[PDB]
Amino acid sequence: SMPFPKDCSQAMLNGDTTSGLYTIYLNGDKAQALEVFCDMTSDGGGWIVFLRRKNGRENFYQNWKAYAAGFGDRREEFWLGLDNLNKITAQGQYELRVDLRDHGETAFAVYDKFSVGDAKTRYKLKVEGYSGTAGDSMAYHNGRSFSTFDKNCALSYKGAFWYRNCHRVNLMGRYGDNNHSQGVNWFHWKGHEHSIQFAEMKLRPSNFRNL
């Protein structure tokens, strides 16, 4: 095993094959411990989950400092934090996976290249290299800074995202809200008038597929 695994891929190769909470260490530094949820089953596992929607119990209409730091219950609905995402994606070349489920239907999106810039970039999104079944709804968002109501799409849709004008993805939107663009949306799968029951966003090294 590795003593200070820097993501869920290094924690999995540590032979831990059960999904759940694991400690990772940013840059492999024992002083930068972070508790994460590892999805060890989806497409080979080793995924850090950074967003989960499943029941509408958690409030996602939260401010910049909350989106920077992270919030929620890692075992249920939560947001990992933009500072964490910046520090993880800085460690190497990461891939994004999005898993969606609604009334028994599932879809997914993978982006071969995924990064989140630091606070001086207002946590700029990079997403490239789409494959999957959900439809490429992140392309619209590529290169955009993060937006919250206090730093306006976040206000208009009462959510937070790498908003443009405004969204094709709104996975931090209002749970079960089928009103146009208000809900947990992935436009090129279920449009803007259908809030998705279950959503996870997760990341791991892009080279994991053949390591």
Ligand X SMILES: Cc1nccn1Cc1cccc(C#N)c1
> Least distance (Å) from ligand X to the CB of residue 37?
6
Mind giving me the DSSP string for 52-84?
EESSS-S-----HHHHHH-EE-TTSSEE--HHH
Subset of residues 97 to 136 that bind ligand X, contact rule: CB under 6 A: none
Give dist(CA 53, CA 186) in Å, integer: 13
Total residues contacting ligand X (rule CB under 6 A)? 9
Residue selected from 71, 130, 187, 198 as contacting ligand X according to rule CB under 6 A = 71
Which span (70-78, 147-155, 179-187, 195-203) binds ligand X, by CB under 6 A? 70-78
Subset of residues 25 to 44 that bind ligand X, contact rule: CB under 6 A: 36
- Tell whether residue 80 is a contact of ligand X (CB under 6 A): yes
- Tell whether residue 64 is a contact of ligand X (CB under 6 A): no
- Tell whether residue 175 is a contact of ligand X (CB under 6 A): no
* Inter-residue contact 50 to 123 (CB < 8 Å): no
Which span (39-47, 69-77, 156-164, 185-193) binds ligand X, by CB under 6 A? 69-77
For residues 36 and 138, which CB has a smaller minimum distance to ligand X in the complex? Answer: 36
> Which CA distances in Å does 196 have to 29, 97, 177, 178?
37, 16, 9, 9
- Tell whether residue 81 is a contact of ligand X (CB under 6 A): yes
Q: Which tokens sit at 137?
A: 């709804």
Give dist(CA 186, CA 208) in Å, integer: 26
Which span (55-63, 68-76, 86-94, 141-149) binds ligand X, by CB under 6 A? 68-76
For residues 24 and 184, which CB has a smaller minimum distance to ligand X in the complex? Answer: 24
CA torsion 189-195-199-203 (nearest 10°) is 60
Which residues are CB-neighbours of 65 under 8 A, at least 6 positions away? Answer: none
- Tell whether residue 69 is a contact of ligand X (CB under 6 A): yes
- Tell whether residue 78 is a contact of ligand X (CB under 6 A): yes
Other beta carbons within 10 angstroms of residue 134's beta carbon come to 23
Q: Which residues bind ligand X (CB under 6 A)?
A: 36, 69-72, 74, 78, 80-81
